[PDB]
């Protein structure tokens, strides 16, 4: 009975859980790798924000969307989707956004969300894998 609320897609992550032979031999190493990797990615997003590098932010966004999607971590993936789009000058209505200043700001907002939601999910997983 694991409730991750809006953070986890039960179908996608559930499939992962069913691959365990009840010590989480497969799922937990994978969750750990996701989080270690996630934080390396955020550091780079931080650096890219400092240097105001929209193209790099987009790539970083695209990458973390893909790894989070594979685990069914949908709240993180949606934040990463935002970073991908705004990096390419596309708003959430899908319109062009020429003003780089606004894109940067939006990405910052989205990155703060992704980071916070990653923390919250990491806590819930630690609890799950310690039972």
TrEMBL record:
The UniProt record lists the keyword Transcription regulation: no
Keywords assigned by UniProt, alphabetized: Phosphoprotein
GO function term, MF aspect, one: histidine phosphotransfer kinase activity
Residue positions, PTM Phosphohistidine: 62
GO cellular component terms listed in the entry, alphabetical order: cytoplasm; nucleus
Residues making up the signal peptide according to the UniProt record: none
GO terms for biological process, alphabetical: phosphorelay signal transduction system
Residue intervals of the HPt domain: 23-128
Top-rank taxon, per record: Eukaryota
Protein name, as recorded: HPt domain-containing protein
Parent-protein start and end of this portion: 43 to 174 of 178
């Amino acid at each position: 009975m694991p409730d991750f609320g809006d953070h986890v897609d039960t179908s996608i992550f559930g499939q992962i859980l069913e691959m365990d032979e009840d010590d989480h031999d497969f799922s937990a190493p994978l969750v750990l790798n996701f989080f270690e990797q996630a934080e390396e990615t955020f550091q780079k997003m931080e650096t890219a924000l400092n240097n105001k590098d929209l193209p790099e932010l987009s790539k970083l966004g695209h990458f973390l969307k893909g790894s989070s999607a594979t685990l069914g971590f949908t709240k993180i993936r949606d934040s990463c989707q935002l970073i991908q789009q705004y990096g390419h000058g596309l708003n959430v209505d899908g319109s062009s956004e020429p003003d780089e200043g606004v894109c940067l700001k939006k990405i910052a907002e989205a990155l703060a969300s992704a980071r916070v939601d990653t923390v919250a999910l990491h806590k819930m997983m630690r609890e799950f894998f310690e039972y």
